[PDB]
Design a protein around this ligand. Structure first.
Ligand SMILES: Cc1nnc(NC(=O)c2cccc([C@H]3C[C@@H]3NC3CCC3)c2)s1
Lengths: 133, 665
């Protein structure tokens, strides 16, 4: 039913190498050249990628910031409330960002907070302003 | 083993009747399965009897005595079976002391052309049957293509050497009948390149398996893809080996392409991700600046100023989270690219060194078929491979010449008698022969039938070495051009000191180039005497016949010198170099299934010729011209046993037409 293993005798390939007297060495060098093309291409991106690597030297260690470890509280100080209204104004609804900004209240409180202080801080009016941008 | 062993040893199914036997015994085959089994046993038995002692005639009575009941109840059937076996050379063939001596008065006159093994086999059989046999020989010796060189103790077959296995081989019988020094072949063959350095086991084994894998490939092309005709021409075997090597070479390239195309596909996933990392670092760089500027405003600050420091801090650690995720990913791609660079696929399908060694495997094929692989039929070249005898091929130590010479004991053999014209008519035949030494002395022979064992190369000769009157019908002449008669030659190197490995019978030499793959590519140590024997196969064969013995012998020493060191190669004492295509009594070595030919052409060769009626309106006559020889036996061509079987075959068919076949009632 099928050829010996490793032998790759397609029904369609034989005709292509049998089509003409020099057809065999045609297809065989049509690929000899195509291989070179990829090799050429590999060097290029290997250079381009190598150049980009150099630019990233230093990584971002110098631009890194120490992490704050502050115990989440549950009381809203007048300050924290104010941080909040601004965070909504600049984030809109990204719960994590707003919790990250206050860095003491959490996403549940933050999420709760909109409905608690709702008419009081005009959050709906604020949120429309965020969506404008 | 048993009775059944004798059927196998006679090339016969032990449990079914052959088409042969259906012809002689149609009552049995069309009859009840019980009688068939009786018959079959009677046959199988009788075969046994002959085989266990093949040095004495097996008379019908002898058979009946040893046969037992209930099988020995129907004497006619036993007599019917034994005659059939005897007629067609399955028993009482070869060289045997006969119990009942030859009838003093013979019936019929048969001229046999050629004292080759087919010829003598028929001759012995016909004489055996009470016919008047005479063989016409062009040569001054019998055996034809069984030639043996002899000088002092030096002995080396220029002709056949090998008995291919005794499982079912009539030569098995003959060897018991004539003492034949039958020595086995140790298959181990070490290959030596042009430098004279042996090829290492790694390499030898890896190229041999490719070679077989390559054949297995051509078979697949022929049968499953039906790649048999190309450009309105039959596909040769060699053609299809090119097309298979090319396709395996293409695949090598294909897989290199696909593999590097999988590096570019990843280097470009890296380059695109590097871009994002470089654009994010700049964004981070300027964020930091903004945060520090925002952090510079010392407290106490109003909340919009506090929000800004917190907002910038949150954002910047967010981007520092992206750039960390995007450099874990860069690590994965960097290692993934590293794997791909280390697992590159095979650089080449085969190296120049590798493919030079591959050639030596094609030279072997060329030497087996005595022809360039471009002439072999793809579809049919191995058609005779089912009927291989079992057992390991042997060589004849005292020369193969002894068989032929032993078959000529008691035969009317005119040597130095070159047949030039065969004339065959409704009423009989006459063959015209000259004396080879003085071509003018002319001979006329009359006979009831001619058996022609002229080699196929002789028959192919234009202009004709032998003319037939009337000419052979085209159906015969066409099968003659269609068929292939090829070439291989031998060089016999005779030396006083054995300076090679005496425990290896054969060892190769890898030719420098493909076009010279068969020039002395194989050497044989077969003999008690110190003789190495060099083969010239493929294209080399036809070419080396235009070159001197000395020049040919030189290239022999050279190669031997290279594999053993200039020091240990003494000048050969006696040199003989065959030139079979040149020989006009052979004009070749043996037949091969040419491209465009088939196994049916051998069948064609063996159908005999019936001439036209002398007086128009007379009844359709008897056939008068019969053909034997290795080119007539489709299942066992180009072999001494095939020749022999064809002589046995025609003898029985000639006996049946002129002595009548009484075993059919
Ligand atoms: C181990 C081995 N097993 N067999 C080995 N030798 C051969 O089969 C052989 C060698 C030379 C010539 C012929 C000729 C009878 C062949 N006609 C052609 C080739 C097959 C159809 C056969 S090598």
């Amino acid at each position: 039913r099928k050829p010996p293993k490793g032998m790759f005798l397609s029904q369609e390939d034989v005709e292509a190498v049998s089509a003409n007297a020099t057809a065999a060495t045609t297809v065989l060098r049509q690929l000899d050249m195509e291989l070179v093309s990829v090799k050429r291409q590999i060097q290029n991106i290997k250079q381009t990628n190598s150049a980009l690597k150099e630019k990233l030297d230093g990584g971002i260690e110098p631009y890194r910031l120490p992490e704050v470890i502050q115990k989440c509280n549950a009381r809203w100080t007048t300050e924290e409330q104010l941080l909040a209204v601004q965070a909504i104004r600049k984030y809109g609804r990204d719960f994590q960002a707003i919790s990250d900004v206050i860095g003491n209240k959490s996403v549940v409180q933050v999420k709760n907070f909109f409905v608690n202080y709702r008419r009081r801080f005009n959050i709906d009016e604020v949120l429309q302003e965020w969506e404008a941008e | 083993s048993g009775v059944e062993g004798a059927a196998f040893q006679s090339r016969l199914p032990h449990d079914r009747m052959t088409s042969q036997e259906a012809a002689c015994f149609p009552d049995i085959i069309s009859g009840p399965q019980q009688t068939q089994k009786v018959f079959l046993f009677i046959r199988n038995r009788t075969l046994q009897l002959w085989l266990d002692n093949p040095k004495i005639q097996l008379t019908f009575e002898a058979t009946l005595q040893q046969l037992e009941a209930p099988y020995n109840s129907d004497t006619v059937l036993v007599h019917r079976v034994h005659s059939y076996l005897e007629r067609h050379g399955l028993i009482n063939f070869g060289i045997y002391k006969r119990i009942k001596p030859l009838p003093t008065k013979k019936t019929g006159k048969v001229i046999i052309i050629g004292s080759g093994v087919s010829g003598l086999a028929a001759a012995r059989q016909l004489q055996s049957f009470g016919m008047d046999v005479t063989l016409l020989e062009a040569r001054d010796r019998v055996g034809g293509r069984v030639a043996t060189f002899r000088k002092g103790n030096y002995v080396a077959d220029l002709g056949a050497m090998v008995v291919t296995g005794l499982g079912g081989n009539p030569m098995a019988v003959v060897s018991k009948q004539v003492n034949m020094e039958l020595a086995k072949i140790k298959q181990k063959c070490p290959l030596y390149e042009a430098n004279g350095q042996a090829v290492p086991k790694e390499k030898d084994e890896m190229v041999e398996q490719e070679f077989n894998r390559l054949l297995e490939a051509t078979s697949y092309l022929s049968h499953q893809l039906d790649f048999n005709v190309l450009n309105n021409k039959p596909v040769s075997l060699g053609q299809a080996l090119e097309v298979v090597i090319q396709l395996q070479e293409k695949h090598v390239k294909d897989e290199q392409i696909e593999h590097w195309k999988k590096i570019v596909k990843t280097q470009e996933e890296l380059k695109e991700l590097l871009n994002k990392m470089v654009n994010l670092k700049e964004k981070i760089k300027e964020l930091h600046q903004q945060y520090k500027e925002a952090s510079e405003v010392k407290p106490p600050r109003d909340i919009t100023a506090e929000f800004l420091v917190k907002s910038k801090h949150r954002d910047l650690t967010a981007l520092c989270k992206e750039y960390d995720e995007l450099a874990e990913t860069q690590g994965k791609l960097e290692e993934k690219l590293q794997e791909l660079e280390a697992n590159p696929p095979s650089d080449v399908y085969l190296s120049s060194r590798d493919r030079q060694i591959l050639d030596w495997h094609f030279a072997n094929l060329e030497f087996a078929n005595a022809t360039p692989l471009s002439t072999l039929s793809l579809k049919h070249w191995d058609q005779d491979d089912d009927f291989e005898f079992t057992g390991s091929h042997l060589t004849v130590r005292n020369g193969y010449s002894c068989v032929p010479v032993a078959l000529a004991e008691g035969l009317d053999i005119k040597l130095n008698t070159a047949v030039r014209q065969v004339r065959y008519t409704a009423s009989g035949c006459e063959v015209i022969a000259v004396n080879t030494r003085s071509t003018s002395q002319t001979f006329i022979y009359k006979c009831d039938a001619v058996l022609c064992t002229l080699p196929l190369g002789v028959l192919k000769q234009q202009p004709p070495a032998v003319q037939f009157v009337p000419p052979l019908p085209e159906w015969k002449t066409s099968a003659v051009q269609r068929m292939g008669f090829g070439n291989l030659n031998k060089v016999v190197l005779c030396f006083d000191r054995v300076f090679w490995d005496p425990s290896v019978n054969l060892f190769g030499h890898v030719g420098s180039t493909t076009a010279s793959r068969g020039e002395l590519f194989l050497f044989w140590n077969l003999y008690k005497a110190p003789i190495l024997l060099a083969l010239v196969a493929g294209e080399a064969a036809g070419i080396m016949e235009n070159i001197s013995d000395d020049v040919i012998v030189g290239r022999c020493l050279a190669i031997l010198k290279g594999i053993f060191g200039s020091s240990a190669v003494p000048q050969p004492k006696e040199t003989v170099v065959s030139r079979w295509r040149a020989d006009p009594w052979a004009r070749g070595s043996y037949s091969y299934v040419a491209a465009g030919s088939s196994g049916n052409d051998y069948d064609l060769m063996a159908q005999p010729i019936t001439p036209g009626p002398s007086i128009p309106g007379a009844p359709q006559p008897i056939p008068r011209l019969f053909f034997a020889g290795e080119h007539t036996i489709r299942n066992y061509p180009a072999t001494v046993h095939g020749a022999l079987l064809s002589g046995l075959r025609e003898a029985g068919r000639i006996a049946d037409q002129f002595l009548g076949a009484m075993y059919t009632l």
